[PDB]
Amino acid sequence: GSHMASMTGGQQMGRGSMSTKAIYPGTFDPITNGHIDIITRAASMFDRVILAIAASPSKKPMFDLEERVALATTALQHLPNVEVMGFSDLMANFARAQQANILIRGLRAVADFEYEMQLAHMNRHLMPELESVFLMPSKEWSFISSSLVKEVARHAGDVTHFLPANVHQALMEKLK
Amino acid sequence: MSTKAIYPGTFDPITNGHIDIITRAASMFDRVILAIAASPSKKPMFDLEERVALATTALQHLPNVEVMGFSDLMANFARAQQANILIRGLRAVADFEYEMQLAHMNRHLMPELESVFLMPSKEWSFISSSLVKEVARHAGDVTHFLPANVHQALMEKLK
C-alpha cells in the first residue's frame, strides 16, 4: 500500500506488475539478425535482458566464448537495457544466480514445439518462479540459423543480409 | 516503460487454464485486457454478455486486469486500446501453425503490436472450453477445471 514493508515484503503473483529480468540463452555461434530481432523485441517489453552465451556447448563451436561474447556485445551495444554474459550451467541455475524471472525462447519450427514444451515443464520443476516466454521470428529471419549461415558461407554463398557487419567480417576471417 | 497486453479469445466459458495464462501475464505486464470476441464463427453456448460477466467475476481478484468484448479487427481494437502486446496461449502443435499465420498477418496490419506466446501449466494442458462443455453435457465431473461462478452457470445452462 505505502510503508507496508514493516508488514510484508510482497508476493510475485496476484498483485499487479513486478520488475522483470529476462535471460535469453543460446550458443550464438555466431549471433545472427534473427537473434538480434528476438532480443530487440524482448528488450522492448521487459525491464532488463541478459543474452546468456553457453561456454561449453556439446558440439565444438566455430567461435570461442570470448569471441562470441565480444561479437554479441558490439551487435547489441545500441540496446541500453541488455547485457551479454557467458554461463556454464543449467539455464535454470544461471537464472537463479542472476535473480531472473523470465526465460526467453525463440520458436522457429513446428518440429521444435514439442521439445520446447518439454523443457518448459522441466524448468518449471527446477525453478517454479521462472516464467518461459515464447517469441516467433520475423518472416524475414524465419529460415536462417547460425548453422545454415556458416555452411552457406563456407562455400562462398552470400550471407551479408543475415549478419551484422562485425559478425560478417569475423566469419569471413574464420573461413580463410 | 508502460506495457499493455490484450488476451483475445471466445472464452465460452473461461476455464482454469485461461485464468492461469492471464494471471502469469498480469504478473509481467502493467495492464492486461481479456478481449472476448462478440460474434465467433460457431454460435457460442454463452452470449457475449454472459461470457464477459463470468470472466469479470473470475478475474476480479487481479488488480491490473480488465474484461471487454470486441467485434472488429484485432489490430483496430489494439490500436483503440493503445495496447502494444498480444498474448496467446499455446496448447498444441496444431494451434501453433495457425497462430504463426495470424501473427504474420497481424505484423502486416499493425507492425507495432508484439505477439507473445505462453505455454499452459501441466495441470491445464489437456483442458479446453470445448472439452469441458462436452464432458459436462454428459454429466461428467468438471469441478476441478472451472471457477465456482462458471461451474454454477454451466450446470444451469444444462438444466
Curated annotation (Swiss-Prot), chain A:
Binding site for substrate: 27, 59, 91, 105
Residue numbers marked as site, Transition state stabilizer: 35
Pfam families in UniProt: CTP_transf_like
Group of enzyme by EC: transferase
Keyword Acyltransferase: no
Single annotated GO MF: pantetheine-phosphate adenylyltransferase activity
Catalytic reaction annotation: (R)-4'-phosphopantetheine + ATP + H(+) = 3'-dephospho-CoA + diphosphate
NCBIfam families: coaD_prev_kdtB, cyt_tran_rel
Protein function: Reversibly transfers an adenylyl group from ATP to 4'-phosphopantetheine, yielding dephospho-CoA (dPCoA) and pyrophosphate.
Subunit-level organization: Homohexamer.
The protein, known as: Phosphopantetheine adenylyltransferase
Organism: Enterobacter sp. (strain 638)
